[PDB]
Amino acid sequence: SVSNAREERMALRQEQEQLQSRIQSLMQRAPVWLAAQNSLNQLSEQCGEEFTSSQDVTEYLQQLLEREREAIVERDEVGARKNAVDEEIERLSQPGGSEDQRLNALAERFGGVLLSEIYDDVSLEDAPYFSALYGPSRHAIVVPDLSQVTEHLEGLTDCPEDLYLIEGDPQSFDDSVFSVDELEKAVVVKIADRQWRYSRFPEVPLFGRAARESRIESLHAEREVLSERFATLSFDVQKTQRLHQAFSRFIGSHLAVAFESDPEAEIRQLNSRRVELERALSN
Amino acid sequence: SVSNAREERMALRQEQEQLQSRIQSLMQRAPVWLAAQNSLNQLSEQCGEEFTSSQDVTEYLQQLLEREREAIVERDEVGARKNAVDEEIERLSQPGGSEDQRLNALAERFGGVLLSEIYDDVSLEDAPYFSALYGPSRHAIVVPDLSQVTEHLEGLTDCPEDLYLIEGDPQSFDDSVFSVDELEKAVVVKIADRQWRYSRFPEVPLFGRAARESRIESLHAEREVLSERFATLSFDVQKTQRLHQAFSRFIGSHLAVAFESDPEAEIRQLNSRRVELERALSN
Ligand SMILES: [N+]
Ligand SMILES: [N+]
């Protein structure tokens, strides 16, 4: 019967050579599973959440990446709009410049209103065109009687060499009328027989500083709201890309190892089992 | 007979007391008639003439005084005219100033002439009025086709905001026409319905720098001819007023005495006569 008793003994060593080498691997495993556990606590500490599983890690990260891309399009979109205003404003600001002061004085002299002020109200898209339109008549003074001037007309001496005057109701003024051919960024009026004026569209037109200055305020409001939202976004992004890179380090290095049962658990268990085997080889 | 012989003797002393005192006066006379003769030679030396008589002195002086007054009205009249030119010139010179250079460039661009040059020819009395007249159309460019511009019209960018153009023959240009009311040192055009322009007469009008610059030359010519004649006159006057005062000194002091027969002539004559008397009182 020697065969059952001898072969039986083999199988116990056979196993013990397995438990021995099996344990040895768990020992290489430990130090790495240590570093792995550190990184996992740390990264899981960076945000209030609990990672029981590796799938949790992948889930928190799907969300992390949307937070990121969305924040990057908004911060980019905002700053785009911000710069579109930094620019806008710049344009409406440079002033030409300079209308004559004397005119203000004469319009005050004769009861009545300036035209720079009557049409100070006009729109931004229209303002440049209408300035070219009235030719040198832009700074005309509007007075309904034209009687005050005729009297004080002789008196005036220092007035600008050409003075333009128009009889109308400043409160409800009735637009002029021209023989005109509109050209790109310019206008061509037939002022008379065989005579024509070409006036370019100005940057900073006489007419419409009031609707203009008014837009320029609205742009400052918006700009400061943008720079405020931009600040919040760009921080938000930096913080997110910082947790992005957080996950990568961990993913590339410690992710496989973690979510394993501690090595020591099986190392001590296998050991009491190998001691049990050795005792049976002893008995 | 004692009476004839004694009384006869008296009359000889009687006379000798006359010759004695008569001679004494001639002696006071001499030194003064000396100084008188010096001044007469001297003054008669100052100008090539001969004074045989006191009437000669009065005659040369009538002439001297006309030379003087006439020279003083001419020198005064000349300098009056000179200063009327120093002034004139000053006025035509101060330049306003300044017409746009770009215009020159554009008129060269389109075959054709400027209006500042078409009317550069006008008169001085008319120039200021016509400048006020054309309003801002003074610097218009005259071109007969108006075709070159329409093509290059779009291209133009930097041109002054208002550009004025007129189709005519620069060589034989046909004046514009306005609805105008002429005012003192100003003009009032009805440019349109319910619209009027007031342009003051300029000092230094755009039109007529060519008839102006041309007058200004003629004034420099004349001015230098005046300052030349003025120089000759004013010297001539100084020299004359110097001979005027020459005559006065002499007139006030030595004129009575001169034109007398030398004292010594009668002093020696009377003396041989008083010696003859004394010899008869002796005999
Ligand atoms: N328009
Ligand atoms: N005139």
Coordinates of C-alpha atoms and ligand atoms in Angstrom, one line a residue:
Chain A
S1 CA 0.0 0.0 0.0
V2 CA 3.1 2.2 -0.1
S3 CA 1.8 4.1 -3.2
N4 CA -1.2 5.9 -1.6
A5 CA 0.8 6.9 1.5
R6 CA 3.8 8.2 -0.5
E7 CA 1.9 10.0 -3.2
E8 CA -0.4 11.5 -0.6
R9 CA 2.7 13.1 1.0
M10 CA 3.8 14.5 -2.4
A11 CA 0.6 16.5 -2.8
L12 CA 1.1 18.2 0.5
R13 CA 4.5 19.5 -0.5
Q14 CA 3.1 20.2 -4.0
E15 CA 0.6 22.5 -2.2
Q16 CA 3.1 23.9 0.2
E17 CA 5.3 24.9 -2.7
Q18 CA 2.3 26.7 -4.0
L19 CA 1.4 28.4 -0.7
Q20 CA 5.1 29.4 -0.4
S21 CA 5.5 31.0 -3.8
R22 CA 1.9 32.3 -3.7
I23 CA 2.7 34.1 -0.5
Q24 CA 5.9 35.5 -1.8
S25 CA 4.0 37.4 -4.5
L26 CA 1.7 39.0 -2.0
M27 CA 4.9 40.3 -0.3
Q28 CA 6.0 42.2 -3.5
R29 CA 2.4 43.3 -3.7
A30 CA 2.3 44.9 -0.2
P31 CA 4.6 47.9 -0.5
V32 CA 2.9 48.9 -3.8
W33 CA -0.6 48.4 -2.3
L34 CA 0.6 50.6 0.5
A35 CA 1.5 53.6 -1.8
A36 CA -1.7 52.8 -3.6
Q37 CA -3.8 53.2 -0.5
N38 CA -2.2 56.5 0.4
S39 CA -2.9 58.0 -3.1
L40 CA -6.5 56.7 -2.9
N41 CA -7.3 58.2 0.5
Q42 CA -5.6 61.4 -0.6
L43 CA -7.5 61.8 -3.9
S44 CA -10.8 60.7 -2.3
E45 CA -10.1 63.4 0.3
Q46 CA -9.7 66.2 -2.2
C47 CA -13.4 66.0 -2.8
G48 CA -16.2 64.9 -0.5
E49 CA -17.0 61.5 -1.9
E50 CA -16.5 57.8 -1.2
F51 CA -14.8 55.4 -3.6
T52 CA -15.9 51.9 -2.6
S53 CA -15.2 50.7 -6.2
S54 CA -13.1 51.4 -9.2
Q55 CA -16.3 52.1 -11.1
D56 CA -16.9 54.9 -8.6
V57 CA -13.6 56.4 -9.7
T58 CA -14.7 56.2 -13.4
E59 CA -18.1 57.7 -12.6
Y60 CA -16.8 60.7 -10.6
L61 CA -14.4 61.3 -13.5
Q62 CA -17.0 61.3 -16.2
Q63 CA -18.6 64.2 -14.2
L64 CA -15.3 65.9 -13.6
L65 CA -14.6 66.1 -17.3
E66 CA -18.0 67.6 -18.2
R67 CA -17.6 70.2 -15.5
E68 CA -14.3 70.9 -17.2
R69 CA -15.1 71.1 -20.9
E70 CA -18.3 73.2 -20.2
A71 CA -16.3 75.6 -18.0
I72 CA -13.8 76.0 -20.8
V73 CA -16.3 76.9 -23.5
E74 CA -18.0 79.4 -21.2
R75 CA -14.8 81.0 -20.0
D76 CA -13.7 81.1 -23.6
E77 CA -17.0 82.4 -24.9
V78 CA -17.2 85.0 -22.1
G79 CA -13.7 86.3 -22.8
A80 CA -14.6 86.4 -26.5
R81 CA -17.6 88.6 -25.7
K82 CA -15.5 90.6 -23.2
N83 CA -12.9 91.4 -25.9
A84 CA -15.7 92.2 -28.3
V85 CA -16.6 95.0 -25.9
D86 CA -13.1 96.2 -25.0
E87 CA -13.0 96.8 -28.7
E88 CA -16.5 98.2 -29.3
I89 CA -16.0 100.8 -26.5
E90 CA -12.5 101.8 -27.8
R91 CA -14.2 102.7 -31.1
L92 CA -17.0 104.9 -29.9
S93 CA -14.6 106.7 -27.7
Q94 CA -12.0 108.3 -29.9
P95 CA -13.4 111.8 -30.4
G96 CA -13.4 114.0 -33.5
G97 CA -13.4 116.7 -32.9
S98 CA -13.7 119.5 -32.5
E99 CA -17.0 121.2 -33.2
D100 CA -16.8 125.0 -32.8
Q101 CA -17.6 126.4 -29.3
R102 CA -18.7 129.7 -30.8
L103 CA -21.7 127.9 -32.4
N104 CA -22.9 126.8 -28.9
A105 CA -22.8 130.5 -28.0
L106 CA -24.7 131.8 -31.0
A107 CA -27.5 129.2 -30.6
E108 CA -27.9 130.4 -27.1
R109 CA -27.9 134.0 -28.4
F110 CA -30.9 133.4 -30.7
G111 CA -33.6 131.5 -28.9
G112 CA -33.2 128.1 -30.4
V113 CA -31.5 124.8 -30.6
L114 CA -28.4 123.4 -32.3
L115 CA -28.7 120.6 -34.8
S116 CA -25.9 118.6 -33.3
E117 CA -28.3 118.4 -30.4
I118 CA -31.6 117.9 -32.4
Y119 CA -30.1 114.8 -34.0
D120 CA -27.9 113.9 -31.0
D121 CA -30.6 111.3 -30.6
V122 CA -30.1 109.2 -33.8
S123 CA -29.1 105.6 -34.0
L124 CA -25.5 104.3 -34.4
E125 CA -26.0 102.7 -37.7
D126 CA -27.7 105.8 -39.1
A127 CA -25.6 108.5 -37.4
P128 CA -22.5 108.3 -39.7
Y129 CA -24.6 108.4 -42.8
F130 CA -26.7 111.5 -41.8
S131 CA -23.5 113.4 -40.8
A132 CA -22.1 112.9 -44.3
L133 CA -25.5 113.8 -45.7
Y134 CA -26.0 117.4 -44.4
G135 CA -22.6 118.4 -45.6
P136 CA -21.3 121.5 -43.9
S137 CA -24.9 122.1 -42.8
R138 CA -24.5 119.6 -39.9
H139 CA -23.7 122.4 -37.5
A140 CA -26.7 124.4 -38.6
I141 CA -28.6 126.3 -35.9
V142 CA -32.3 125.7 -35.9
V143 CA -34.5 128.7 -35.2
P144 CA -38.2 129.0 -36.2
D145 CA -38.5 132.8 -36.8
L146 CA -35.2 133.6 -38.4
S147 CA -36.1 137.1 -37.2
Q148 CA -33.8 137.4 -34.2
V149 CA -30.8 136.7 -36.5
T150 CA -31.8 139.2 -39.2
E151 CA -31.7 141.9 -36.5
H152 CA -28.5 140.7 -34.8
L153 CA -27.2 139.6 -38.2
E154 CA -25.3 142.8 -38.9
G155 CA -23.9 142.9 -35.4
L156 CA -22.0 139.6 -35.6
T157 CA -18.4 139.8 -36.4
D158 CA -16.3 137.0 -35.0
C159 CA -18.7 134.2 -36.0
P160 CA -17.1 131.4 -38.0
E161 CA -16.8 132.4 -41.6
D162 CA -19.6 130.2 -42.7
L163 CA -22.7 130.1 -40.6
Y164 CA -25.6 127.8 -41.3
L165 CA -29.2 128.4 -40.2
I166 CA -32.5 126.5 -40.6
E167 CA -36.1 127.5 -39.6
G168 CA -38.0 124.7 -37.9
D169 CA -39.5 123.5 -34.7
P170 CA -36.7 122.0 -32.6
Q171 CA -39.2 119.9 -30.6
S172 CA -40.8 118.3 -33.7
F173 CA -38.2 119.0 -36.4
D174 CA -38.9 118.2 -40.0
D175 CA -36.0 116.5 -41.8
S176 CA -34.3 118.1 -44.7
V177 CA -34.4 116.6 -48.2
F178 CA -31.6 116.0 -50.7
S179 CA -30.9 114.7 -54.2
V180 CA -28.7 111.9 -53.2
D181 CA -26.9 108.8 -54.4
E182 CA -25.7 106.6 -51.5
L183 CA -22.3 105.0 -52.0
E184 CA -20.4 102.6 -49.8
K185 CA -19.0 104.6 -46.8
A186 CA -19.8 107.9 -48.6
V187 CA -22.6 109.9 -50.1
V188 CA -23.0 112.0 -53.3
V189 CA -25.4 114.9 -53.1
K190 CA -26.3 117.0 -56.1
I191 CA -26.2 120.4 -54.3
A192 CA -26.9 122.3 -57.5
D193 CA -26.8 122.3 -61.3
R194 CA -23.5 120.9 -62.4
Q195 CA -22.3 120.9 -58.7
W196 CA -22.0 117.9 -56.4
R197 CA -20.6 117.3 -52.9
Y198 CA -18.9 114.1 -51.8
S199 CA -18.9 113.6 -48.0
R200 CA -17.3 110.5 -46.4
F201 CA -19.0 108.7 -43.5
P202 CA -17.1 110.0 -40.5
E203 CA -15.8 107.8 -37.6
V204 CA -17.3 109.8 -34.8
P205 CA -20.2 111.5 -36.6
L206 CA -21.6 114.8 -35.4
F207 CA -25.1 113.4 -35.0
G208 CA -26.0 110.9 -32.3
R209 CA -23.5 111.4 -29.5
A210 CA -26.4 110.9 -27.1
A211 CA -27.5 107.4 -28.4
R212 CA -23.7 106.8 -28.6
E213 CA -22.6 107.9 -25.2
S214 CA -25.6 105.9 -24.0
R215 CA -24.5 102.7 -25.7
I216 CA -21.0 103.2 -24.3
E217 CA -22.4 103.1 -20.7
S218 CA -24.3 99.9 -21.5
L219 CA -21.0 98.4 -22.7
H220 CA -19.2 99.3 -19.4
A221 CA -22.0 97.7 -17.4
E222 CA -21.8 94.5 -19.4
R223 CA -18.0 94.6 -19.5
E224 CA -17.7 94.5 -15.7
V225 CA -20.3 91.8 -15.5
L226 CA -18.3 89.8 -18.0
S227 CA -14.9 90.3 -16.3
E228 CA -16.6 89.1 -13.1
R229 CA -18.1 86.0 -14.6
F230 CA -14.8 85.4 -16.4
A231 CA -12.9 85.5 -13.2
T232 CA -15.2 82.9 -11.6
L233 CA -15.0 80.7 -14.6
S234 CA -11.2 80.8 -15.1
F235 CA -10.7 79.9 -11.4
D236 CA -13.3 77.2 -11.6
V237 CA -11.3 75.8 -14.6
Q238 CA -7.9 76.0 -12.9
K239 CA -9.4 74.1 -9.9
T240 CA -10.9 71.5 -12.2
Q241 CA -7.8 70.9 -14.3
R242 CA -6.0 70.5 -11.0
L243 CA -8.3 67.6 -10.0
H244 CA -8.1 66.3 -13.6
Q245 CA -4.3 65.9 -13.2
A246 CA -4.9 64.5 -9.7
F247 CA -6.8 61.6 -11.2
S248 CA -4.2 60.9 -13.9
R249 CA -1.3 60.5 -11.5
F250 CA -3.4 58.0 -9.5
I251 CA -4.8 56.3 -12.6
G252 CA -1.4 55.8 -14.2
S253 CA 0.3 54.5 -11.1
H254 CA -2.0 53.1 -8.3
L255 CA -5.3 52.3 -9.9
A256 CA -4.8 48.6 -10.7
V257 CA -3.5 47.8 -7.3
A258 CA -6.1 49.5 -5.1
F259 CA -9.5 48.0 -4.7
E260 CA -7.8 44.7 -3.8
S261 CA -8.1 42.9 -0.5
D262 CA -5.1 43.7 1.8
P263 CA -2.2 41.3 1.1
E264 CA -1.6 40.7 4.9
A265 CA -5.1 39.2 5.0
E266 CA -4.3 36.2 2.8
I267 CA -0.6 36.2 3.9
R268 CA -1.4 35.4 7.5
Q269 CA -4.3 33.1 6.5
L270 CA -2.1 31.1 4.1
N271 CA 0.6 30.9 6.9
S272 CA -1.7 29.3 9.5
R273 CA -2.6 26.9 6.6
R274 CA 1.0 26.1 5.7
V275 CA 1.7 25.5 9.4
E276 CA -1.2 23.1 9.4
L277 CA 0.3 21.3 6.4
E278 CA 3.7 21.2 8.0
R279 CA 2.1 19.7 11.1
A280 CA 0.5 17.0 9.0
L281 CA 3.9 16.2 7.4
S282 CA 5.1 16.0 11.0
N283 CA 2.4 13.7 12.4
Chain B
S1 CA 36.3 244.6 -36.9
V2 CA 37.0 242.3 -34.0
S3 CA 33.6 240.6 -34.4
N4 CA 34.1 238.9 -37.8
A5 CA 37.6 237.7 -36.8
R6 CA 36.6 236.3 -33.4
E7 CA 33.3 234.7 -34.5
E8 CA 35.0 233.2 -37.5
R9 CA 37.3 231.4 -35.1
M10 CA 34.4 230.0 -33.1
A11 CA 32.9 228.3 -36.1
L12 CA 36.2 226.4 -36.7
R13 CA 36.2 225.0 -33.2
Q14 CA 32.4 224.5 -33.5
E15 CA 33.2 222.3 -36.5
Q16 CA 36.2 220.6 -34.9
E17 CA 34.1 219.6 -31.9
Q18 CA 31.8 218.1 -34.5
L19 CA 34.6 216.3 -36.4
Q20 CA 36.0 215.1 -33.0
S21 CA 32.8 213.6 -31.7
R22 CA 31.8 212.5 -35.2
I23 CA 35.0 210.5 -35.4
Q24 CA 34.6 209.0 -32.0
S25 CA 31.3 207.3 -33.0
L26 CA 33.0 205.7 -36.1
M27 CA 35.4 204.2 -33.6
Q28 CA 32.7 202.4 -31.6
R29 CA 31.4 201.4 -35.1
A30 CA 34.6 199.7 -36.3
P31 CA 34.8 196.6 -34.1
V32 CA 31.2 195.8 -34.8
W33 CA 31.5 196.4 -38.5
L34 CA 34.5 194.1 -38.3
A35 CA 32.4 191.2 -36.9
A36 CA 29.7 192.2 -39.4
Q37 CA 32.1 191.8 -42.3
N38 CA 33.2 188.3 -41.1
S39 CA 29.6 187.0 -40.9
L40 CA 28.8 188.4 -44.3
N41 CA 31.7 186.9 -46.1
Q42 CA 31.0 183.6 -44.3
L43 CA 27.3 183.4 -45.1
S44 CA 27.9 184.6 -48.6
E45 CA 30.5 181.9 -48.9
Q46 CA 28.0 179.2 -47.9
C47 CA 26.3 179.5 -51.2
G48 CA 27.8 180.7 -54.5
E49 CA 26.3 184.1 -54.8
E50 CA 27.4 187.8 -54.4
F51 CA 25.7 190.2 -52.0
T52 CA 26.5 193.7 -53.1
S53 CA 23.4 195.0 -51.4
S54 CA 21.1 194.3 -48.4
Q55 CA 18.3 193.8 -51.0
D56 CA 20.3 191.0 -52.4
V57 CA 20.2 189.3 -49.0
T58 CA 16.4 189.7 -48.9
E59 CA 16.0 188.3 -52.4
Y60 CA 18.2 185.2 -51.9
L61 CA 16.1 184.6 -48.8
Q62 CA 12.7 184.8 -50.5
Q63 CA 14.0 182.0 -52.7
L64 CA 15.5 180.1 -49.8
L65 CA 12.1 180.0 -48.0
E66 CA 10.2 178.7 -51.0
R67 CA 12.8 176.0 -51.5
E68 CA 12.1 175.2 -47.9
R69 CA 8.3 175.1 -47.6
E70 CA 8.0 173.2 -50.9
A71 CA 10.5 170.6 -49.8
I72 CA 8.6 170.2 -46.5
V73 CA 5.3 169.5 -48.1
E74 CA 6.8 167.1 -50.5
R75 CA 8.8 165.2 -47.9
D76 CA 5.7 165.2 -45.7
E77 CA 3.4 164.2 -48.6
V78 CA 5.9 161.4 -49.7
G79 CA 6.2 160.0 -46.2
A80 CA 2.5 160.1 -46.0
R81 CA 2.2 158.0 -49.1
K82 CA 5.1 155.8 -47.9
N83 CA 3.3 155.0 -44.7
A84 CA 0.1 154.4 -46.6
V85 CA 1.9 151.6 -48.3
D86 CA 3.8 150.1 -45.3
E87 CA 0.2 149.7 -44.1
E88 CA -1.4 148.4 -47.4
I89 CA 1.3 145.7 -47.7
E90 CA 1.0 144.7 -44.1
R91 CA -2.7 143.9 -44.7
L92 CA -2.4 141.8 -47.9
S93 CA 0.3 139.8 -46.3
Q94 CA -1.1 138.2 -43.2
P95 CA -2.2 134.8 -44.5
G96 CA -5.3 132.7 -43.7
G97 CA -4.8 130.0 -44.0
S98 CA -4.6 127.2 -44.5
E99 CA -6.4 125.6 -47.4
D100 CA -6.1 121.9 -47.5
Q101 CA -3.1 120.4 -49.3
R102 CA -5.0 117.2 -50.1
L103 CA -7.3 119.2 -52.4
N104 CA -4.4 120.2 -54.6
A105 CA -3.6 116.5 -54.9
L106 CA -7.1 115.4 -55.9
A107 CA -7.5 118.1 -58.5
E108 CA -4.3 116.8 -60.0
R109 CA -5.7 113.3 -59.8
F110 CA -8.7 114.1 -61.9
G111 CA -7.7 116.0 -64.9
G112 CA -8.9 119.5 -64.0
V113 CA -8.4 122.7 -62.1
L114 CA -9.0 124.0 -58.6
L115 CA -11.4 127.0 -58.1
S116 CA -9.0 128.8 -55.8
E117 CA -7.0 129.0 -59.0
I118 CA -9.8 129.7 -61.5
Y119 CA -10.7 132.7 -59.5
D120 CA -7.2 133.4 -58.2
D121 CA -7.5 136.1 -60.9
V122 CA -10.3 138.3 -59.3
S123 CA -10.0 141.9 -58.1
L124 CA -9.2 143.0 -54.6
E125 CA -12.5 144.7 -54.0
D126 CA -14.4 141.8 -55.3
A127 CA -12.3 138.9 -53.9
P128 CA -13.6 139.1 -50.3
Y129 CA -17.2 139.2 -51.3
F130 CA -17.0 136.2 -53.7
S131 CA -15.2 134.1 -51.1
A132 CA -18.1 134.6 -48.6
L133 CA -20.5 133.9 -51.5
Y134 CA -19.5 130.3 -52.5
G135 CA -19.8 129.2 -48.9
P136 CA -17.9 126.0 -48.3
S137 CA -17.9 125.5 -52.1
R138 CA -15.0 127.9 -52.5
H139 CA -12.5 125.0 -52.6
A140 CA -14.5 123.1 -55.2
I141 CA -12.7 121.2 -57.9
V142 CA -13.8 122.1 -61.4
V143 CA -13.9 119.1 -63.8
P144 CA -16.0 119.0 -67.0
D145 CA -16.8 115.3 -67.3
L146 CA -17.4 114.3 -63.7
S147 CA -16.7 110.9 -65.0
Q148 CA -13.2 110.3 -63.7
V149 CA -14.4 111.0 -60.2
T150 CA -17.4 108.7 -60.4
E151 CA -15.0 105.9 -61.2
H152 CA -12.3 106.8 -58.6
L153 CA -15.1 108.0 -56.3
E154 CA -15.4 104.7 -54.4
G155 CA -11.6 104.4 -54.1
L156 CA -11.1 107.7 -52.2
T157 CA -10.8 107.3 -48.5
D158 CA -8.7 109.9 -46.8
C159 CA -10.2 112.9 -48.7
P160 CA -11.5 115.7 -46.5
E161 CA -14.9 114.8 -45.1
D162 CA -16.7 117.2 -47.4
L163 CA -15.6 117.4 -51.0
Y164 CA -17.0 119.9 -53.4
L165 CA -17.1 119.4 -57.2
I166 CA -18.3 121.4 -60.2
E167 CA -18.5 120.6 -63.9
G168 CA -17.3 123.4 -66.1
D169 CA -14.6 124.5 -68.5
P170 CA -11.7 125.9 -66.4
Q171 CA -10.5 128.0 -69.4
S172 CA -13.8 129.7 -69.9
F173 CA -15.7 129.0 -66.6
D174 CA -19.3 130.0 -66.2
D175 CA -20.0 131.6 -62.8
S176 CA -22.4 130.0 -60.4
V177 CA -25.7 131.6 -59.4
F178 CA -27.1 132.2 -55.9
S179 CA -30.3 133.6 -54.2
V180 CA -28.5 136.3 -52.3
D181 CA -28.9 139.4 -50.1
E182 CA -25.7 141.4 -49.7
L183 CA -25.1 142.8 -46.3
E184 CA -22.3 145.0 -45.0
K185 CA -19.2 142.9 -44.6
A186 CA -21.2 139.7 -45.0
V187 CA -23.6 137.8 -47.3
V188 CA -26.8 135.9 -46.8
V189 CA -27.6 133.1 -49.2
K190 CA -30.8 131.1 -49.3
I191 CA -29.2 127.7 -49.8
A192 CA -32.6 126.0 -49.6
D193 CA -36.1 126.1 -48.4
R194 CA -36.1 127.4 -44.8
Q195 CA -32.3 127.1 -44.8
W196 CA -29.8 130.0 -45.1
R197 CA -26.0 130.5 -44.9
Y198 CA -24.3 133.6 -43.4
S199 CA -20.7 133.9 -44.5
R200 CA -18.6 136.9 -43.4
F201 CA -16.2 138.6 -45.8
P202 CA -12.8 137.2 -44.9
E203 CA -9.6 139.1 -44.5
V204 CA -7.4 137.1 -46.8
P205 CA -10.1 135.7 -49.1
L206 CA -9.6 132.4 -50.9
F207 CA -10.1 133.9 -54.3
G208 CA -7.7 136.4 -55.9
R209 CA -4.3 135.7 -54.4
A210 CA -2.9 136.3 -57.9
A211 CA -4.2 139.8 -58.4
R212 CA -3.3 140.3 -54.7
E213 CA 0.2 139.0 -54.8
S214 CA 0.5 141.1 -57.9
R215 CA -0.6 144.3 -56.2
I216 CA 1.8 143.5 -53.3
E217 CA 4.7 143.6 -55.8
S218 CA 3.6 146.9 -57.2
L219 CA 3.6 148.2 -53.7
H220 CA 7.1 147.1 -53.0
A221 CA 8.3 148.8 -56.1
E222 CA 6.6 152.0 -55.2
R223 CA 7.7 151.8 -51.6
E224 CA 11.3 151.7 -52.4
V225 CA 11.0 154.6 -54.9
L226 CA 9.3 156.6 -52.1
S227 CA 11.9 155.8 -49.5
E228 CA 14.5 156.9 -52.0
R229 CA 12.8 160.2 -52.8
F230 CA 12.0 160.7 -49.1
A231 CA 15.7 160.4 -48.3
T232 CA 16.7 163.0 -50.9
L233 CA 13.9 165.4 -49.7
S234 CA 14.6 165.1 -46.0
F235 CA 18.3 165.8 -46.5
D236 CA 17.4 168.7 -48.8
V237 CA 15.3 170.0 -46.0
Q238 CA 17.9 169.7 -43.3
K239 CA 20.4 171.5 -45.5
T240 CA 17.9 174.3 -46.2
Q241 CA 16.8 174.8 -42.6
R242 CA 20.5 175.0 -41.9
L243 CA 20.9 177.9 -44.3
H244 CA 17.7 179.4 -42.9
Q245 CA 19.2 179.5 -39.4
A246 CA 22.4 180.8 -41.0
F247 CA 20.6 183.9 -42.3
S248 CA 18.8 184.5 -39.0
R249 CA 22.0 184.8 -36.9
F250 CA 23.4 187.3 -39.3
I251 CA 20.1 189.1 -39.7
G252 CA 19.6 189.6 -36.0
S253 CA 23.1 190.7 -35.3
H254 CA 25.2 192.0 -38.2
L255 CA 22.7 193.0 -40.9
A256 CA 22.2 196.7 -40.0
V257 CA 26.0 197.4 -39.8
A258 CA 27.1 195.7 -43.0
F259 CA 26.6 197.4 -46.3
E260 CA 28.1 200.5 -44.8
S261 CA 31.3 202.2 -46.0
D262 CA 34.3 201.2 -43.9
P263 CA 34.6 203.5 -40.9
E264 CA 38.4 203.9 -41.4
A265 CA 37.6 205.6 -44.7
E266 CA 35.9 208.6 -43.1
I267 CA 38.0 208.4 -40.0
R268 CA 41.2 209.1 -41.8
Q269 CA 39.5 211.6 -44.1
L270 CA 38.1 213.6 -41.2
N271 CA 41.5 213.5 -39.6
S272 CA 43.3 215.2 -42.4
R273 CA 40.5 217.7 -42.4
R274 CA 40.8 218.3 -38.6
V275 CA 44.5 218.7 -39.1
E276 CA 43.7 221.3 -41.8
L277 CA 41.4 223.1 -39.3
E278 CA 44.0 223.1 -36.6
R279 CA 46.6 224.5 -39.0
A280 CA 44.2 227.4 -39.7
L281 CA 43.7 228.0 -36.0
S282 CA 47.5 228.0 -36.0
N283 CA 48.2 230.4 -38.9
Ligands
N1 N -29.5 104.7 -44.6
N2 N -20.2 143.1 -55.3

